[PDB]
């Protein structure tokens, strides 16, 4: 009866609005009515009705909402696609300012978009020829409020990217700038960030890798990864996008390391090993770190920042790769500043075992004497003066006093031989160098 | 691509929904029921390469024949067809009434009458089945675009007749 009312009074927008809302609510309430009205001839008929009634936005919004609630949970054919998508695209173009119409149209297109391949190619080309991308980008870029539409837009553009003729068409329109703006405008959300980070990698082209867009992308990527460090899905998508950027251009990671990207890797390496193991995620991160391993000035900056923080696990990996332990800026040595900032004994142990000049060590000894700490000074003397020839040579140093705790471990103390079976750092370095060598 | 509307009219209890279910829903024969109101069906035809046509079949309920046949149904319509059962001359007079009503209350952009076809419903039933000689009198007198026997249950000639009618309709 409702359908008959609609049909017999097409000239009035009010009857269409009310009856359309009624049967849309009915269809949303009961799933059984779906595909029955569809088999009865409702879709193209109401499409023709919105073709007849276009001067009002309420009629278009009600029609788009009704299509959304009708076509949900169903799969259509190519003919239905050709009969639905152009008409709704034209309706959305004719009413571009009205937010509810845009929201409903985007939701409908999202639910409806996704021998046979040959036919589908024609529909894909015709859809791109209908300027769907221009309209959706204009809608998502002009009006940034009402977050849901933004989410819908991102979803739609996602379904756009994975068209054969879409990558360059999107590159012309500048989809990246709008997406990155959305990510800046919606940091706290998960879904917007989740879809956006995945879309950034897919959009990547050589045109926008340079400065002015790559620098902002690096800042956003680090902010996004840092915002949700624990969420595996977000980090995995971000690292995949980062790997794609690195593969596209090696000029990247110059500012990423500058923009505190090391905090991302070190926590993940610590977390992934301590938490559940994901071989794909771990190897993806290791491959990215391998691409970062070049340009050894970056490695030196990495070591300075890794040593500033208590990061005993990573410093061994970094040393195994290379990155000599005498990278001082002449203000203070690495061993000096690590000893200053109340660092763990394992840090200075790895520093001493690797290449460290004697004078800096003596400076570290004096500094560690000033802040009396038995463990560090004992580990320092283990390298400055002990022989092989079972002899101390604790001489020329001007230490103000001596205490038994200082030279405790210096004596052999053969009661037990300490065992350190932790190969975590060694393995991590082994995979990083494996990917570095294999890639080269 | 294009879309068109075809209105199926006829007498009561002539299996008015049987033909439209057979051509679109692929449902033939079945139980005989009464059509309370106007019902719809969709057809998609790949008539030509890169040219796909959509058809809206509106099966007008003939129970309220005495009631004023509103021009709103025929409004914006592009084609029509009259289908009558072959077991009653009252259905034949009713088909004449439908022809007169559509000629009175239907218009085209060119002004010429829209194509009409005489469907001889349910010829697979005795005894008045193949009386085409008597039907030819109205076939040539009414100036119909076509006339063709049919059987809804058997679907013997629904497809060819519909194809001929739609080819004539796009021929205008």
CA pair distance B160, A85, nearest whole angstrom: 32
Burial (Cβ within 10 Å: 0-12, 13-18, ≥19) of residue B116:
buried
Decide if A41 and B42 are in contact by the 8 Å CB cutoff. yes
Q: How many CB pairs under 8 A join A and B?
A: 31
Note whether A40 contacts B: Cβ–Cβ < 8 A.
yes
Annotated binding residue B31: yes
CA pair distance B55, B45, nearest whole angstrom: 8
CA pair distance A200, A332, nearest whole angstrom: 41
Q: Length of chain A in residues, anyone?
A: 440
Q: Give A408's contacts (C-beta < 8 A, 6+ positions apart).
A: A374, A378
Could you tell me the CA-to-CA distances from A357 to A322, A330, A344, B104 in Å, in that order? 16, 13, 20, 110
B87, B101, B85: which is closest to B142 by C-alpha?
Answer: B101
Annotated binding residue B86: no
Would you call B45 helix, strand, or coil by DSSP?
strand
Q: Are A47 and A86 spatial neighbours (Cβ–Cβ below 8 Å)?
A: no
Note whether B44 contacts A: Cβ–Cβ < 8 A.
yes
Which phi-psi region, left, alpha or beta, contains residue A355 (left: φ > 0; alpha: ψ -120 to 50)?
Answer: beta
**Experimentally, how was this structure solved?**
cryo-EM
Annotated binding residue B152: yes
Note whether B72 contacts A: Cβ–Cβ < 8 A.
yes
Note whether A118 contacts B: Cβ–Cβ < 8 A.
no
Q: Which two tokens stand for residue A435?
A: 């990917």
Residues paired with B149 in a beta bridge: B120
Give per-residue burial for B157-167: e unless 16+ CB within 10 Å, then b: bbeebbebbbe
Give the minimum alpha-carbon distance from B3 to chain A in angstroms, rounded to a whole number: 9
A50, A48, A83: which is closest to B78 by C-alpha?
Answer: A48
Q: Which two tokens stand for residue A36?
A: 């029955």
- For CA atoms A424, A425, A428, A434, the dihedral sign is negative
Give the minimum alpha-carbon distance from B139 to chain A in angstroms, rounded to a whole number: 32
CA pair distance B124, B110, nearest whole angstrom: 39
- Which ranges in A309-357 belong to alpha helices (H)? 312-321, 334-340, 345-353
Note whether A4 contacts B: Cβ–Cβ < 8 A.
yes
Return the residue in B54, B71, B77 with the most chain A beta carbons within 10 A, the one to mutate for interface testing.
B54
Q: Which two tokens stand for residue A43?
A: 């879709």
Give the minimum alpha-carbon distance from A153 to chain B in angstroms, rounded to a whole number: 29
Phi first, then psi, for residue B45 (nearest 5°) are -125, 130
Supply the angle between the helices A175-185 and A132-142 in degrees, to the nearest 10.
30
Cβ-based contacts of A70 with chain B (< 8 Å): none
Decide if A82 and B54 are in contact by the 8 Å CB cutoff. no
R_g (Cα) of chain B, nearest Å: 15
| Max Cα-Cα span within chain A | 109
Q: Are B117 and B161 spatial neighbours (Cβ–Cβ below 8 Å)?
A: yes
End-to-end CA separation in angstroms for chain A: 72
Note whether A44 contacts B: Cβ–Cβ < 8 A.
yes
Q: Are B153 and B53 spatial neighbours (Cβ–Cβ below 8 Å)?
A: no
R_g (Cα) of chain A, nearest Å: 32
Phi first, then psi, for residue A96 (nearest 5°) are -95, -30
Of all residues in chain B, the one with the smallest CA distance to A80 is: B44
H/E stretch holding B94: helix B89-104
Annotated binding residue B90: no
CA pair distance B156, B124, nearest whole angstrom: 9
Q: Are A154 and A144 spatial neighbours (Cβ–Cβ below 8 Å)?
A: no
CA pair distance B53, B25, nearest whole angstrom: 17
Could you tell me the CA-to-CA distances from B25 to A36, B28, B43 in Å, in that order? 11, 9, 9
Interfacial B residues in 90-129 facing A (CB < 8 Å): none
Q: Give B91's contacts (C-beta < 8 A, 6+ positions apart).
A: B10, B11, B14, B84, B85
CA pair distance A108, A186, nearest whole angstrom: 24
Cα B7 → chain centroid: 7
Nearest to B56 among A4, A39, A41 (CB): A41
Note whether A120 contacts B: Cβ–Cβ < 8 A.
no
Annotated binding residue B43: no
- Report which DSSP code applies to A295: S
Could you tell me the CA-to-CA distances from B58 to A41, A314, B41, B68, B108 in Å, in that order? 10, 75, 7, 17, 18
Q: Which two tokens stand for residue A137?
A: 């980008």
Nearest to B52 among A39, A45, A82 (CB): A82
Q: Which residue has the tokens 């190897």?
A: A283
Q: Which residue has the tokens 């012309």?
A: A172
Decide if A44 and B54 are in contact by the 8 Å CB cutoff. yes
CA pair distance A282, A43, nearest whole angstrom: 49
CA pair distance A431, B145, nearest whole angstrom: 81
Give the minimum alpha-carbon distance from B116 to chain A in angstroms, rounded to a whole number: 23
Q: What is the dihedral of CA A27, A33, A38, A44, to 10 degrees?
A: -30
CA pair distance A279, A431, nearest whole angstrom: 11
Return the residue in B21, B43, B44, B60 with the most chain A beta carbons within 10 A, the one to mutate for interface testing.
B44
Task: Tell me whether the omega of the peptide bond preceding residue A227 falls within 30 degrees of 0, making it cis.
Answer: no
Note whether A122 contacts B: Cβ–Cβ < 8 A.
yes
Note whether A82 contacts B: Cβ–Cβ < 8 A.
yes
Q: Which residue has the tokens 């009409």?
A: B116
Annotated binding residue B29: yes
Q: Give A171's contacts (C-beta < 8 A, 6+ positions apart).
A: A203, A205, A207
Q: Are A382 and A409 spatial neighbours (Cβ–Cβ below 8 Å)?
A: yes
CA pair distance A44, B42, nearest whole angstrom: 9
CA pair distance A96, A102, nearest whole angstrom: 7
Cβ-based contacts of A3 with chain B (< 8 Å): 40
* 3-class SS shares of chain B: helix, strand, coil, % to 5: 30, 25, 45
Q: Are A392 and A410 spatial neighbours (Cβ–Cβ below 8 Å)?
A: yes
């Amino acid at each position: 009866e409702v359908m008959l009312s609609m049909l017999m009074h097409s000239s009035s927008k009010e009857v269409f609005q009310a009856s359309a809302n009624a049967l849309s609510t009915l269809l949303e309430q009961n799933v059984n009515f779906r595909k029955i009205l569809l088999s009865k001839g409702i879709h193209l008929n109401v499409l023709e009705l919105m073709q007849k009634h276009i001067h009002s936005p309420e009629v278009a919004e009600s029609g788009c909402k009704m299509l959304n609630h009708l076509f949900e949970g169903s799969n259509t054919s190519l003919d239905i696609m050709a009969a639905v998508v152009p008409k709704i695209l034209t309706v959305m173009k004719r009413h571009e300012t009205s937010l509810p119409v845009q929201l409903e149209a985007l939701r409908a297109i999202l639910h409806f978009i996704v021998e046979f391949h040959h036919k589908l190619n024609m529909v894909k080309k015709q859809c791109f020829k209908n300027d769907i991308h221009k309209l959706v980008l204009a809608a998502l870029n002009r009006f940034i409020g009402n977050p849901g539409i933004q989410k819908c837009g991102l979803k739609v553009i996602s379904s756009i990217v994975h068209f054969p003729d879409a990558l360059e068409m999107l590159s012309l329109e500048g989809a990246m700038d709008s997406v990155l703006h959305t990510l800046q405008m919606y940091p706290d959300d998960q879904e917007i960030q989740c879809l956006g980070l995945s879309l950034i990698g897919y959009l990547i082209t050589k045109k926008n890798v340079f400065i002015g867009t790559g620098h902002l992308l690096a800042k956003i990527l680090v902010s996004s990864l840092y915002r949700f460090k624990d969420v595996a899905e977000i980090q995995t998508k971000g690292f995949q996008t980062i790997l794609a950027i690195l593969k596209l251009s090696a000029s990247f990671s110059k500012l990423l390391v500058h923009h505190s990207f090391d905090l991302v890797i070190f926590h993940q390496m610590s977390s992934n090993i301590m938490e559940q193991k994901d071989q794909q995620f771990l190897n993806l991160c290791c491959k990215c770190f391998a691409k970062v391993a070049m340009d050894d000035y970056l490695k030196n900056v990495m070591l300075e920042r890794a040593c500033d923080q208590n990061n005993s696990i990573m410093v061994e990996c970094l040393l195994l790769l290379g990155a000599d332990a005498n990278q001082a800026k002449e203000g203070s040595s690495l061993i000096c500043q690590v000893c200053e900032k109340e660092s763990s004994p394992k840090l200075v142990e790895l520093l001493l075992n690797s290449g460290s000049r004697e004078q800096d060590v003596r400076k570290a000894l004096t500094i560690s004497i000033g802040k009396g700490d038995s463990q560090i000074i004992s580990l320092l003397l283990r390298r400055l003066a002990l022989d092989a020839n079972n002899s101390i040579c604790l001489g020329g140093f001007c230490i103000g006093k001596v205490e038994p705790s200082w030279l405790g471990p210096l004596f052999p103390d053969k009661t037990s031989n300490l065992r350190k079976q932790t190969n975590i750092a060694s393995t991590l370095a082994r995979m990083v160098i494996r990917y570095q060598m294999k890639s080269a | 691509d294009h879309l068109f509307k075809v209105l199926v009219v006829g007498d009561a209890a002539v299996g008015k929904t049987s033909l439209v279910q057979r051509y679109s829903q692929d449902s033939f024969s079945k139980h005989y029921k009464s059509t309370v109101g106007v019902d719809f069906a969709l057809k998609v035809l790949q008539w030509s390469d890169y040219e796909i046509v959509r058809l809206q079949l509106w099966d007008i309920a003939g129970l309220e024949r005495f009631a004023a046949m509103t021009r709103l149904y025929y409004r914006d319509a592009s084609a029509c067809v009259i289908m009558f059962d072959v077991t009653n001359a009252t259905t034949f007079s009713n088909s004449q009434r439908w022809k007169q009503d559509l000629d009175s209350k239907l218009t085209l952009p060119n002004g010429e009458p829209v194509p009409c076809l005489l469907l001889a419903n349910k010829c697979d039933l005795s005894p008045w089945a193949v009386s085409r000689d008597q039907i030819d009198r109205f076939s040539k007198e009414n100036g119909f675009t076509g006339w063709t026997e049919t059987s809804v249950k058997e679907n013997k000639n629904i497809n060819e007749a519909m194809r001929v009618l739609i080819e004539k309709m796009m021929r205008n």
